[PDB]
Design a protein around this ligand. Structure first.
Ligand SMILES: CCCN(CCC)C(=O)c1cc(C)cc(C(=O)N[C@@H](Cc2cc(F)cc(F)c2)[C@H](O)[C@@H]2NCN(Cc3ccccc3)C2=O)c1
Length: 390
């Protein structure tokens, strides 16, 4: 590990998001910021809100610059409205650099802020093509690279605990690492495998094959990427295109048929509980996602365990049972590889080489019999045809 200053700089959990500490303004105003590879705007609460115990105060910053422009971002989940400006930004547990970046000061929001998440803003790490109001609003990471010597690359190690974290526990727990400008080798085991970033907007990738316990889901691979597949730390679940979701759930039910689970469970709405320590991990199948490799006709696979797709949740009775919600859900906007999937891997966003790397995470949750895996290579033909075109 060569980036020790950034190791363990994340806090949070899949259900409420992972955040990094940042400072905005002069003198510096400390704020916790959601790490979101699924959007491209740097936005912070800038006005009182029931769920915020602190917010960006522009009138207290000598370096604040008002852009005199409004901004609106409608996420899949929620929305916020704000005022555009720029100011000096730093990451305390990051590269020792200060940059002037665009900041959307949030003045109105609906279903955006999460009660108890402990974060006051969002860091959209994706490309300008999806930034609001338009692609002219330079994303934070672009500013960072243009203004400093920081390598055009960042890596994420999101660490799920494998068990419920209460309100005090999640505040004192290390939730992972965001390494700005590099790859830290202590965060993963085995080899890193790269998949091409298909297009620079979201971090778009191409899935070429899907297996449930080694059994081919056997769908036209173009279904797996309808209308796109993205890597998104700002989404909890593995979200799958309607048809893929239906087929995957049918296969996961078949593999786990020794136990019957209520429809509410499969809909990701209701929790299932087992007596402490008795979770039957072995009846649930591993899920393998094959990703286009950098070599022609070559792919690699990332394999996740139910310890990743079953999300730990506190029992409504706070009892001693181990409870979980099914963290795979349907999408109408393509595949979303959310935080529960990212928790099994060290993920390298290699912007400079337009590729995303995957390696088994040093902090993924597993059991004595199975482990998450990143394996390759596999001969795979016509992978370009798995990509969806409008
Ligand atoms: C991560 C905590 C839990 N959580 C959000 C609260 C339920 C989710 O798991 C979850 C579930 C669903 C269905 C969507 C999203 C959800 O939109 N998450 C967004 C961030 C986010 C995080 C958050 F905690 C609250 C938000 F209101 C938005 C992502 O950016 C998402 N990725 C692609 N995209 C499309 C897009 C990109 C750029 C501009 C417009 C649209 C998105 O909206 C998150």
């Amino acid at each position: 590990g060569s980036f020790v200053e950034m190791v363990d700089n994340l806090r949070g959990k899949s259900g409420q998001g992972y955040y990094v500490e940042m400072t905005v303004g002069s003198p510096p105003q400390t704020l916790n910021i959601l790490v979101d590879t699924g959007s491209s705007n740097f936005a912070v609460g800038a006005a009182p809100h029931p769920f915020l115990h602190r917010y960006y105060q522009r009138q207290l910053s000598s370096t604040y610059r008002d852009l005199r422009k409004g901004v609106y971002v409608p996420y899949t989940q929620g929305k916020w409205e704000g005022e555009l400006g720029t100011d000096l930004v730093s990451i305390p547990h990051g590269p020792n650099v200060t940059v002037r970046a665009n900041i959307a000061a949030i003045t109105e929001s609906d279903k955006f802020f999460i009660n108890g998440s402990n974060w006051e803003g969002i860091l959209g790490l994706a490309y300008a093509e999806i930034a609001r109001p338009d692609d002219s609003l330079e994303p934070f990471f672009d500013s960072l690279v243009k203004q400093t010597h920081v390598p055009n690359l960042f890596s994420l190690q999101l660490c799920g605990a494998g068990f419920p974290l209460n309100q005090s526990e999640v505040l004192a727990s290390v939730g992972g690492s965001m390494i700005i400008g590099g790859i830290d080798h202590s965060l993963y085991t085995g080899s890193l495998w790269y998949t091409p970033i298909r297009r620079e907007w979201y971090y778009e990738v191409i899935i070429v094959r899907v297996e449930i316990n080694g059994q081919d889901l056997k769908m036209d691979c173009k279904e797996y990427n309808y209308d796109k597949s993205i890597v998104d730390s700002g989404t909890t679940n593995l979200r799958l295109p309607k048809k893929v979701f239906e087929a995957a759930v049918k296969s996961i039910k078949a593999a786990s048929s020794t136990e019957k689970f209520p429809d509410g469970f499969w809909l990701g709405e209701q929790l299932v509980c087992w007596q402490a320590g008795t979770t039957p991990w072995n009846i649930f199948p591993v899920i393998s996602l094959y990703l286009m490799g950098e070599v022609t006709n070559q792919s690699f696979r990332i394999t996740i365990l139910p310890q990743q797709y079953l999300r730990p949740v506190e029992d409504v009775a706070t009892s001693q049972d181990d409870c979980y919600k099914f963290a795979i859900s349907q999408s109408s906007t393509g595949t979303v590889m959310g935080a529960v999937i990212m928790e099994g891997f060290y993920v390298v966003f290699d912007r400079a080489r337009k590729r995303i790397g995957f390696a088994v995470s040093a902090c993924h949750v597993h059991d004595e019999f199975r482990t998450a895996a990143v394996e390759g290579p596999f001969v795979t033909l016509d992978m370009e045809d798995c990509g969806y075109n409008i």
